[PDB]
């Protein structure tokens, strides 16, 4: 079980840090978390293969987290019956984006996909596919629960609504948070408790905390405080402004979680 | 006056050849022809600056020619006259909806002028630009410095070539989208004695049948068109990915056009 960082930069892809994308691998099955522009080329450079991706999870509808998605699907198709659809989980709006973009570009994908949309709430920002609704008691979204994994989402605060994802082996726990300046109620501490790996943004340095919060971002001290509060075993910082063990992510870094 | 190749590959971007994008530069003013995924990052790696781009021309709505556009506009905005965008019907709504979905407020104004294709181009505020039946071309603009026109190509979906004429008469640069041929005589006439002619050669001549099946050309097809137009120099691009003067385009190649 490992995470491969494809893009570790904030706001846009650069020559030194790609736009947001991380792949979680379990037993040859790949799950992609975020898909900024250039993700498909970062995949090509990596040891991973786009064709092995079975699920995709989008944290929020800022372009550095999803503009690479149409390209990625097209290329997977161009290079390919798959039996099971690729499952795509993300905020409301994502399903129509993909459908329209594929139609506009006259792309007939050779595989089936389904988009499951998470419904955000207005307090996340300043004042056949499923629709997935918050459970107010649990304070989370159930994405899926099978024999191997339970995967859930929780609400973050950002300039637009943003989500974190919790992956639990039925075992190891990996939590991956979208851009944020905070978490809505106890959703994070609950789901992220004793995470084996916690992936958190740290867009700006601690001296720029005011600017960070302004833009719905975090600094390393904010991430670290959340990690300590959740008793995470490992904290990995990512989504750096372009130019408990704590690791600063770089593109193509692979972190394994031993059993 | 120079031409800079940003991406020279076919169908998708790779680590060795980016998706379609070429920049024409005159006296510090940059015009971009096509905008595949990764174009913004190629620009960063190049000696060019995204912020100097004043016009963008899209040959056809295949993703390897436009999926990079939303990202490019966002990054130009983040890092900074209106930008003029020319391309097929459908492009304007694509850009508008994508900006809205991603909650992007661009700091510059842009306008999208749409070219209306004809049905025989494929197998059986902003302007809406019609084919002129007398001239068999589309007038994009005509000022004291330049006359720029589009003409119809045959591809799997409708595709366009662009003719740029400097007034002295002066230099003529013609850049053709993906195609297996030109539709009627509008194109041969506009490309006559081109100083530089940029043409695809997706597959080698031994795969001509496969090339034509996919609305593509081989080097002999491109060469024959260059000879027919009496072009001075032919540059081949849009090469299949590793999965009369004739020059083979590579990413970051710069060709200077003397007066
Ligand atoms: Na790879
Ligand atoms: Zn971001
Ligand atoms: Zn964001
Ligand atoms: Zn193409
Ligand atoms: Zn094409």
């Amino acid at each position: 079980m490992d995470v491969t960082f494809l893009g570790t930069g904030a706001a846009y892809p650069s020559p030194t840090r790609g736009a947001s994308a991380v792949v979680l691998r379990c037993e040859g099955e790949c799950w992609l978390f975020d898909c900024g522009e250039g993700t498909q080329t970062q995949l090509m450079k990596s040891q991973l293969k786009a064709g092995r991706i079975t699920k995709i999870f989008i944290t929020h509808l800022h372009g550095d987290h999803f503009f690479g998605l149409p390209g990625l699907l097209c290329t997977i198709s161009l290079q390919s019956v798959s039996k099971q659809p690729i499952e795509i989980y993300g905020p409301v709006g994502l399903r129509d984006f993909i459908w329209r973009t594929m139609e506009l570009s006259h792309t007939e994908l050779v595989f089936h996909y389904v988009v499951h949309e998470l419904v955000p709430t207005a307090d996340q920002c300043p004042a056949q596919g499923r629709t997935i609704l918050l459970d107010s008691e649990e304070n989370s979204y159930l994405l899926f629960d099978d024999e191997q994994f339970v995967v859930k989402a929780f609400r973050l605060f950002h300039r637009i609504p943003s989500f974190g994802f919790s992956v639990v082996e039925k075992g190891r726990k990996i939590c991956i948070l979208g851009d944020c300046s905070g978490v809505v109620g106890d959703g994070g501490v609950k789901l992220c408790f004793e995470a084996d790996l916690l992936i958190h943004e740290a867009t700006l340095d601690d001296a720029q905390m005011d600017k960070a919060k302004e833009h719905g971002h975090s600094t390393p001290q904010m991430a670290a405080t959340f990690a300590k509060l959740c008793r995470a075993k490992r904290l990995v910082l990512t989504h750096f402004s372009q130019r408990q063990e704590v690791t600063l992510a770089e593109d193509f870094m692979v972190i394994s979680i031993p059993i």
Side-chain angles (χ1 to χ4, degrees), chain A residues 1-26 28-48 50-51 53-79 85-99 101-107 109-127 129-146 149-185 187-189 191-220 222-227 229-242 246-259:
Chain A
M1 180 181 298
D2 47 66
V3 165
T4 297
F5 289 82
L6 295 169
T8 61
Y12 56 91
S14 80
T16 59
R17 296 184 186 280
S20 290
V22 195
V23 177
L24 175 60
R25 201 172 55 132
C26 311
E29 170 159 2
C30 290
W31 302 347
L32 178 65
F33 291 82
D34 285 341
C35 196
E37 176 158 8
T39 299
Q40 62 166 299
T41 316
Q42 295 296 86
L43 288 163
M44 297 173 70
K45 295 190 198 144
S46 79
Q47 293 294 108
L48 306 162
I53 291 172
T54 55
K55 306 186 194 291
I56 303 174
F57 301 88
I58 303 301
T59 57
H60 68 295
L61 296 175
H62 274 161
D64 55 309
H65 306 257
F66 79 102
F67 281 168
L69 192 54
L72 181 60
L73 297 177
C74 287
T75 296
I76 289 167
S77 181
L78 279 169
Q79 300 179 333
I86 290 176
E87 298 175 353
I88 303 175
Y89 299 85
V92 168
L94 185 61
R95 187 184 303 121
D96 291 343
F97 174 73
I98 297 167
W99 171 268
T101 303
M102 297 297 102
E103 184 177 43
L104 184 63
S105 61
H106 299 256
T107 298
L109 297 167
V110 297
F111 59 87
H112 306 281
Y113 71 97
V114 295
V115 182
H116 298 310
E117 291 187 327
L118 280 72
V119 176
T121 65
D123 57 340
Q124 289 188 252
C125 64
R130 293 198 282 120
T131 295
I132 305 176
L133 307 174
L134 185 70
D135 181 305
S136 195
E137 176 173 26
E138 300 269 335
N139 201 15
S140 67
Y141 304 81
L142 186 54
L143 302 202
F144 55 98
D145 191 344
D146 62 36
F149 297 104
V150 190
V151 183
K152 298 178 176 166
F154 56 101
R155 296 175 297 161
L156 308 175
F157 193 92
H158 185 48
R159 298 199 309 293
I160 63 168
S162 179
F163 299 100
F165 299 101
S166 175
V167 178
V168 171
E169 180 196 41
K170 300 202 179 160
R172 292 167 279 198
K173 173 185 285 188
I174 307 302
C175 297
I176 303 174
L177 283 58
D179 297 0
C180 67
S181 184
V183 177
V184 183
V189 179
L191 273 173
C192 292
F193 184 67
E194 295 185 326
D196 296 287
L197 179 64
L198 173 56
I199 305 180
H200 199 293
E201 69 139 289
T203 303
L204 296 175
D205 58 276
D206 291 329
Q208 306 195 72
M209 189 179 278
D210 290 343
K211 184 169 194 226
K213 290 179 176 170
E214 253 190 55
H215 294 91
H217 289 310
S218 293
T219 70
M222 296 167 55
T225 291
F226 179 68
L229 188 62
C230 297
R231 306 183 159 170
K233 294 161 194 126
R234 296 169 189 84
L235 177 59
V236 185
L237 300 179
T238 194
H239 197 270
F240 300 111
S241 178
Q242 295 281 11
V246 58
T247 301
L248 312 172
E250 298 175 2
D251 297 1
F252 303 106
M253 180 178 286
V254 187
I255 297 168
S256 292
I257 306 300
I259 194 170

